[PDB]
Amino acid sequence: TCPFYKKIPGTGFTVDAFQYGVVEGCTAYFLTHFHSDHYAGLSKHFTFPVYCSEITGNLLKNKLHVQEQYIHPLPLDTECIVNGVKVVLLDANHCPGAVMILFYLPNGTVILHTGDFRADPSMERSLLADQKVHMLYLDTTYCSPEYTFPSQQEVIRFAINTAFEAVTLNPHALVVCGTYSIGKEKVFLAIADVLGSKVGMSQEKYKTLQCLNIPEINSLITTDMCSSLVHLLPMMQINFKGLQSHLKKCGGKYNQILAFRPTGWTHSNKFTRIADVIPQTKGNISIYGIPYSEHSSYLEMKRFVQWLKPQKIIPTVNVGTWKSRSTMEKYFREWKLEAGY
Ligand code: NI
């Protein structure tokens, strides 16, 4: 059974609600992004209308085989009428194709569903500038002040400088980057660009990346592993055993691995600055954990909410424990008393 924070009142609509069977009263199922916790339940046998971005709809068709007649792609930043209700899709600054959804209800209520997002001051100059929001369905993944991390631009600067230095010292070093979902593509693209290489990967990953509308992608990626000195591997393989095994397969082309694991936040962020980050090393293999987040930090979330001034907030993450719920409600009241809404 579908929980309340996935239903949009006054509509036939649900958001990210595919694992509950047929939802009573639902005439259109919105999907904010192609991450498995959110699409859980969709397959080629799905027969109700799905509304999404173009990039999400390419993934639904090619990766999950949803039939085309049920995929309804909408352009971003454009007022659209769906089943008699005005909606807009906005870029969420999450993974490729990820959207927030603005719903203009028939009674005059305006609702923003953020999906998963990384709040940014640029969102203060989107179509949100123009009008009031009564209800905010908020991605609260890192809603506590202990959650700090650097900008994506600082993290990429660290990765590129670390990879360029290592491979210039040792031309026979291979770089490996872990992945397990879409998102975070700038990590491996930025490293391969500084090295003058294509990125090498499995056929399954190449297929996924070909659905993402990245400009000049054919110039950046390949399935010919022998031609490339930046390889992608599943995230589960980014450990000393899996990397040793990979280096064997490379026919004596390389004598060292430098590997990256993009994570979200980890507790070493409470102590260590990005510039001071060091790897774990075993012989000729080194592994860097880098805190590349596609969700809001606490401070980014607080800024966005204090700017938007919603009348009511419904969290969509960390909703399963009383302690998490109580914590989040305390911070929403702090924010509201501090800003005066
Ligand atoms: Ni996500």
Curated annotation (Swiss-Prot):
Impact noted for substituting residue 139 to N: Impaired nuclear focus formation, reduced interaction with PIAS and increased sensitivity to cisplatin
Cell compartments where the protein resides: Nucleus
Domain of life (superkingdom): Eukaryota
Induction description: During mitosis. The mRNA encoding this protein contains an internal ribosome entry site (IRES) in its 5'-UTR. This 5'-UTR generally suppresses translation while specifically promoting expression during mitosis, when cap-dependent translation may be impaired.
Tissue-wise expression: Expressed in brain, heart, kidney, liver, pancreas, placenta and skeletal muscle.
Family: Belongs to the DNA repair metallo-beta-lactamase (DRMBL) family.
Description of how the protein assembles with itself and partners: Binds constitutively to TP53BP1. Binds CDC27, which is itself a component of the anaphase promoting complex (APC). Binds PIAS1.
UniProt function note: May be required for DNA interstrand cross-link repair. Also required for checkpoint mediated cell cycle arrest in early prophase in response to mitotic spindle poisons. Possesses beta-lactamase activity, catalyzing the hydrolysis of penicillin G and nitrocefin. Exhibits no activity towards other beta-lactam antibiotic classes including cephalosporins (cefotaxime) and carbapenems (imipenem).
Protein's UniProt name: DNA cross-link repair 1A protein
Annotated gene: DCLRE1A
Region of the whole protein represented: 700 to 1040 of 1040
